[PDB]
Design a protein around this ligand. Sequence first.
Ligand SMILES: Nc1ncnc2c1ncn2[C@@H]1O[C@H](COP(=O)(O)OP(=O)(O)OP(=O)(O)O)[C@@H](O)[C@H]1O
Ligand SMILES: Nc1ncnc2c1ncn2[C@@H]1O[C@H](COP(=O)(O)OP(=O)(O)O)[C@@H](O)[C@H]1O
Ligand SMILES: Nc1ncnc2c1ncn2[C@@H]1O[C@H](COP(=O)(O)OP(=O)(O)O)[C@@H](O)[C@H]1O
Ligand SMILES: Nc1ncnc2c1ncn2[C@@H]1O[C@H](COP(=O)(O)OP(=O)(O)O)[C@@H](O)[C@H]1O
Lengths: 443, 434, 146, 48, 434, 426
Amino acid sequence: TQRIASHSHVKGLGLDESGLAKQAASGLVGQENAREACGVIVELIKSKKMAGRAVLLAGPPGTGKTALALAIAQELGSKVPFCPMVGSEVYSTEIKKTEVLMENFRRAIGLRIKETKEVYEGEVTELTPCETENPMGGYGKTISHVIIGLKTAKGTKQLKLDPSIFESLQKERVEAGDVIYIEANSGAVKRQGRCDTYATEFDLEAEEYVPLPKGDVHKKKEIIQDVTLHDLDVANARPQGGQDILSMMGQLMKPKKTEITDKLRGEINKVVNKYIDQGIAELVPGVLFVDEVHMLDIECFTYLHRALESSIAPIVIFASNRGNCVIRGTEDITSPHGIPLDLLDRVMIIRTMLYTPQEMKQIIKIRAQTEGINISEEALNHLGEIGTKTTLRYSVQLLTPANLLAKINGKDSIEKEHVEEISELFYDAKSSAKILADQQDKY
Amino acid sequence: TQRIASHSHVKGLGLDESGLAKQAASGLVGQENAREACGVIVELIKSKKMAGRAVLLAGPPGTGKTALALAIAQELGSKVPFCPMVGSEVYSTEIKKTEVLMENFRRAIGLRIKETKEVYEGEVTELTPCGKTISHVIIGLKTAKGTKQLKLDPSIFESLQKERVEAGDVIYIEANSGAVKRQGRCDTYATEFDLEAEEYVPLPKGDVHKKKEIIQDVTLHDLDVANARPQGGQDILSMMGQLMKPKKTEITDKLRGEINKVVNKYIDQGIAELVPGVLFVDEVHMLDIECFTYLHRALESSIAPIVIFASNRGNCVIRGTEDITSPHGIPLDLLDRVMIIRTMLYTPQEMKQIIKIRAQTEGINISEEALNHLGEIGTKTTLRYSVQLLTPANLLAKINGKDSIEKEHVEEISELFYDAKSSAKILADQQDKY
Amino acid sequence: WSPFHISLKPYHISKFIYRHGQIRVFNHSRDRWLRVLSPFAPDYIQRSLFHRKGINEESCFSFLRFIDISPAEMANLMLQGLLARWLALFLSLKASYRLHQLRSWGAPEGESHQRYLRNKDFLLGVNFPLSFPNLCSCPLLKSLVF
Amino acid sequence: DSYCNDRSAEYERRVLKEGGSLAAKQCLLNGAPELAADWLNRRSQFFP
Amino acid sequence: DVTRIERIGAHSHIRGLGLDDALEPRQASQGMVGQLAARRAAGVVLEMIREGKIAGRAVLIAGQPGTGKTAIAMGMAQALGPDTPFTAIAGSEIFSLEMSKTEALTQAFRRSIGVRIKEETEIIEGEVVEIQIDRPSKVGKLTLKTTEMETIYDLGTKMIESLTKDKVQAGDVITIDKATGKISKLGRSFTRARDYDAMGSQTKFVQCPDGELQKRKEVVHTVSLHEIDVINSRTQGFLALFSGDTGEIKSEVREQINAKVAEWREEGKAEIIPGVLFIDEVHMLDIESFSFLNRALESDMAPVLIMATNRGITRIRGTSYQSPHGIPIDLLDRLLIVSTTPYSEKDTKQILRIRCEEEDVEMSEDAYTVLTRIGLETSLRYAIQLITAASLVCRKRKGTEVQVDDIKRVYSLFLDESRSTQYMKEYQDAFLFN
Amino acid sequence: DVTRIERIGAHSHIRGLGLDDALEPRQASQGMVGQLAARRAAGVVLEMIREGKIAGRAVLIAGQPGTGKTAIAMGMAQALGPDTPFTAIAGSEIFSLEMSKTEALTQAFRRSIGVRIKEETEIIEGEVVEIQIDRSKVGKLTLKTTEMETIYDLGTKMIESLTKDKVQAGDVITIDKATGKISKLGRSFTRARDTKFVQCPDGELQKRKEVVHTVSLHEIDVINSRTQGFLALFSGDTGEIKSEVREQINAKVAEWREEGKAEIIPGVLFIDEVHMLDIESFSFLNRALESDMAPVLIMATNRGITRIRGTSYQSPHGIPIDLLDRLLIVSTTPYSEKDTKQILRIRCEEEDVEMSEDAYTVLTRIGLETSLRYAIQLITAASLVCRKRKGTEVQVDDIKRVYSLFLDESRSTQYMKEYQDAFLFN
Ligand SMILES: Nc1ncnc2c1ncn2[C@@H]1O[C@H](COP(=O)(O)OP(=O)(O)OP(=O)(O)O)[C@@H](O)[C@H]1O
Ligand SMILES: Nc1ncnc2c1ncn2[C@@H]1O[C@H](COP(=O)(O)OP(=O)(O)O)[C@@H](O)[C@H]1O
Ligand SMILES: Nc1ncnc2c1ncn2[C@@H]1O[C@H](COP(=O)(O)OP(=O)(O)O)[C@@H](O)[C@H]1O
Ligand SMILES: Nc1ncnc2c1ncn2[C@@H]1O[C@H](COP(=O)(O)OP(=O)(O)O)[C@@H](O)[C@H]1O
């Protein structure tokens, strides 16, 4: 079964139909105004009206801003792209900072486009070039068509084909008892190998045999294929399927990202609009979640001023835990949240708040019953108390090690005497710093 | 003859059989307490048991730190790898700093292999291949000491064909390597035409066939580098080798793992033997704090060579910290992983002996009255400066038609070439002009 | 008009350096050991791959069993130089179309009561919607990669 | 280009000016040795 | 006898992490002494690693120099054993010159998760005795030997071609995989090592195979999740496993691999083995790299992290800010901190005893007593370094057991930091730069 | 007159560091004057370079700007002559983008030490008189010198070579017998009618010649790096040569020395403007100057006690004491009026200009009021003013014209302070 992580319980925002928050629902507890706010943002993303609008979740360490951002992705579900990033990802060795941001802005926009596939396949039982009764004038013989007899686990039938197929059927080393396929939209033929039926005809042969096709000789299906605009950017900027020196040299060489030009972005925008107009393809504008924003550089922020104002951009969600820090890439310029004031003017802030002693107790129970652990009430009333003296993360951190110690001492549930033993093994940030300060001459 | 250079007089540590130092021996003088310590390090490297153990030589400029480090390489001799490097070598433009450390740590460990080198050479008397396709090829060879026949495999035959060998050519085959070399046509056929483009050589006067026992030295680093990137395979003759320029690259951890596992196989089979050697990271205070921290890992590893460090700094700032001072310019965290040997300044009588040993190494005759003067000037300046004046003094003695340095020669040279101390006094006076 | 055309005099190398001076030649006996002690010799690959002692026991080259590659192909590709690479690449392009048909229609049910990876099962790159095989197979995505 | 005054050296450089081997030269010039072999007879195919 | 490639080092005697079945630490076992509280904690996290139920966990080990932090991690790695990945790096290794600090950390994570797969095989492996072919399509037969049996195959057309391409002959040892069809030479039989006397540039001699000629079985392969990412980076990407030359794997590839591995564990085709990542000297990760760990420790598949550090309250690299351990507070509360304690005289004796047992040395009880004082007046690590030197002095003296006088000789030759830095002040103006 | 590439520049008049056989520096010779102490000292170092026995030795030339401390090094490079390697670089030239900073110094050492060999060749040289071919092929030719004739039968590979190069009767040609290369030297004067013309050779047709040849130690290293390494000896792409290759080549050249198959020719590295190497680069020269295959190196500098690059530390010459103990310092001194006047005379001779004795006098005073290089620049300008005026000799009023047009730095600084706020960023 799947492993457990620091957000595995977050299943949604947990709202009424009226859009008011519930005290505890879909794995979340508390933060009601911030959850109500994210409710509005989910409707904004589902509306498909808007571009470039952005929100900053602001609040101290361990208050739920990452959890809430993840919850929005649950409300939207799998069909619309949600792209996570951290501020520290922009500093690549291959490519400039502003290109990393621009790629991510194009990852968070999807196409869904749908098309038929048709193919013929089977073991070839016969190749029967068919002559006309008389040749054309002056000629010795004339062939009107080839018959190919294909068989599969479901049956057998003849296909009748244009004489020009015959050249291809000797470029490929096709012989009777091979299995082949023909792409019905293109007319090309490809060999797969000798059928598995014949695997016994020598003690050794230097070919891998392939099993007989199952289902009909002629196959059809409709499939829906989904791609980001960033995938179209890259596939056009470095082509594939080389039969030329430029391609093959380019494919033996070490691949590296490159600064994709604004012309290519332009041309891709022009053609996907033609397909959207013709009803061939559906756009799904998505979300970019830039976490840990306070790690971006002032050059990056000053690029975002242009990026967020573009008519194309996705919805952007930002997060930060900083107070009045200096902006990276400047010497002295302090600002709220570690962000420039003139970017912070372009975002709606959502504010996130510390938990009360009752709320922590309620979350620790939700962790235990998802991490697969049983706890007695007299132990939980100790662990929520430790949480109040220390931090939510540390009081949640003790659950699994307490369970392990309980199991080694032969019990099926955490008890008081377990948690007050684990607390003696592992310090926290607050208590460790005290130990350093009493001993500062020895580090 | 070999050129004389800055350390060519030191020939070993020159300790007696009890391990104690002699006053003056093997081209060193003085420094008993400090160079008896190198004796113990030499025994440690010869013991082969240890890995990653490390030493720091510390003391002011011109006190013998690199002389002692090179004296150790003499006492070990060419059997054992000794890799010198300068701290400043770490800052490559092709690879990360810790990669340069790790390559140099590998270079100081050697495989030592034995094989019988076997050589056939002479004029080709016949070529005859040997069913459906060539099973073997017979070849005959001749020299002025006799004739032989050999039985070649088809791989060697392909190589003869590639060299454009035919009967009457003079050939060198090396039977181990599969190496084949054409050396020209035999001069008995030199009259086949009056002008033809070949070069003709006389029939060899040596033996048709020769055997030696040889010993091959290769380090673990050579195995890493050869095996990591595809070997080019070009004896030229293949234009694809022209396109992809070489570069150094971060060797992966996985590959060094496999190389360790394959070398262990061969030293179990008796085919190879192992020599743990020495890495001498000279000028160590030029390392960065990143690199100093990585040494805390590499010196613990149960494969690493013995490492020798040397430094001349007082309480300077550690590079890359902008702030933190530490002894010898090395972080305290690392300085607690090395044993320290102190190195001491010379008394005037010591410098006189060094000057005389340099003079008779460098080839110069010097009179007692002149040697006392270079002794005095060494106390005013520095030993490394008195030893510079010997050659120019000799060259003036020679111009004035005399064999031996006399007082007026060193006295003239002293007025003509300045010291850093006395030149700095000039810069303090004419301060506004530079 | 046509550009100005020039040749310098050719770079002269002495016989002495052409005979005694290339490290490629004078160290050929020593160099052979570095190819003998290689972990890429087909001897060592077989012994590493099939003749282990633990039930669980990590060994390199285990990936070779899930790409299409044999020990002889791998040793060749490590030692023969850039031509081997070019030919191996050319064959790999031809092979990718065949893998795509099998992977995209032949998908239903496990071959084994759901055990075992098949040969070629780490070659994932064909699965992408915009891979050359798929983009050749589907007539319409071909127009978005222009 | 390099000049060296030795018969064997002159044999080597001649190979480089012609192109190192038929395989390597065909590989660059016609794309693969398979494609070189086909290209010779593509005179005789309707849809090459 | 013969010196293998691995030999006696620092963390060499620790052969696990000495614990009873109730995870009570013994006073002395598996080569460890004292540190009882940290050893219990180490036991609990080791049990957590072995279960592998929960992802992204992290522990930090903290405490003064020479108190066992890396000893406990190097002990724990052996208790855990092979078959479970454990990747160790120094903090300073992530600063690559060819990928970002993000990628160096990303790969270090993806390298500590293993996938296990079953594979169903048959292979033939033997010495070839004779290949026979005739022209009526071609028809042929081929004969294989192994020490237990000699047998024949009626091979088809494409095999006949392939054997000519690969140029097999009698006495070659070969393998084939019948499912795939591909041939592969291993070498020539020792029994045939004389049918030539000048062998090609590379041919290699092997023993003739034994047992059954066509062995059929399951095999189980474990492969690190990182390699699946690299093989999918480019058209012949596997070469980069050894070369190190792989440049910022595109994000959509790692996502695709995670999807596929999740599918295989639901199918039961594969299973995921969580391992460990150890970063020693973590205090020199940079502020951008710390902010990446804040989201690396949150994936559905991440290792457990163990990190070790020696720093007090000190400035975080890449900033002005002071913090505990030199680590940001927004990471220190995702961690869980284990603290060492300085050792007593009692522990200092026992750990020196274990080192003399590992380095194969005998000492007088007086000598252990004197050494214990030296190792308590000055660092533990200095006393550990004296014992080898004491042995080497003893051998030169023609003794056998190290006496007090052997300690005092070495203590006179090799200085610690505190004696050294004092002597550097008595002559300070002779050294360079402060 | 026709123009070389090498027109007149700032040191062109120096044609040797001029001295007598006892290394006494005469008062003016070979285009240079004054600097008695420095030129004698430079002569002693030139004798060390030429004798060659001692490796890894260095000297620092130091003193105020415009005191001949490049001049003596430029003169010494003439006096040492060709066929002993001398390499000159500015200290700012080692800061490569393509190659490490310590690699560029390592490579600069090895450009400046040479391996020398001698070898023998069978050569044909003569006028061709007849050439014949048939329908394998066999042909024949006849050759002539002033002194003898021969006919030769041709083998197949020569028939290919002669037919390829379209040799015709009356051509004068040279043939590398061993290799089949044809060199053509033009046509004989007696068949210049019916292209360059020459007289036919003397002596015999087939000469065993002997050729002495020499290669820099660097140039061995680069040829060994790649499939055709020698191209990187031009294109500059010689990126970070692997140190284990250099390790090998040194051991090979050491055995060539001892077996007598080649001999090693030391040389000079003139690293100019040394005060702007980093402390990392100094720390490498510290220890590069200890090899048996180190050249002699000569360093110039004009800096007082200053902060050494890449640090906060201060030291003489802008170089650390750590490196200054490896070397001897030769100190230049500023000029008197006599020397200044005489140097101006020598520059006038090199530039081909004449001036009045009073014109030399006023220009000498300018030279002392504003540093030599200013005065030396006035000379060319003054002659251009005279030519515009249709004069011939330079007069005092032509000098005083130019002194009012083109400023020196001291006057220009004074005329900047009166408009202080009109300039940017002061
Ligand atoms: N005890 C000695 N006996 C003989 N020669 C010595 C002795 N000590 C030093 N020398 C010589 O004097 C010079 C001293 O170089 P030394 O080893 O002191 O360099 P250092 O300043 O310690 O370190 P570095 O090599 O970094 O400059 C060399 O010529 C050396 O050979
Ligand atoms: N409102 C909430 N309801 C449930 N669990 C929460 C809530 N807020 C935080 N948590 C949990 O507490 C921990 C801290 O939340 P996180 O999103 O990482 O905080 P932050 O991003 O503010 O630092 C996580 O394990 C998270 O799943
Ligand atoms: N408890 C212990 N048992 C055994 N050896 C120990 C113990 N603690 C430390 N050591 C040894 O002492 C030395 C220093 O320990 P180490 O863990 O490397 O120091 P640090 O805690 O500063 O990283 C090593 O040789 C180590 O093997
Ligand atoms: N003794 C001299 N003989 C000739 N020219 C000299 C002499 N001394 C200086 N010069 C002139 O001074 C200039 C060179 O100045 P110099 O002192 O060598 O350079 P730097 O100040 O950069 O060290 C040139 O114009 C050169 O001709």
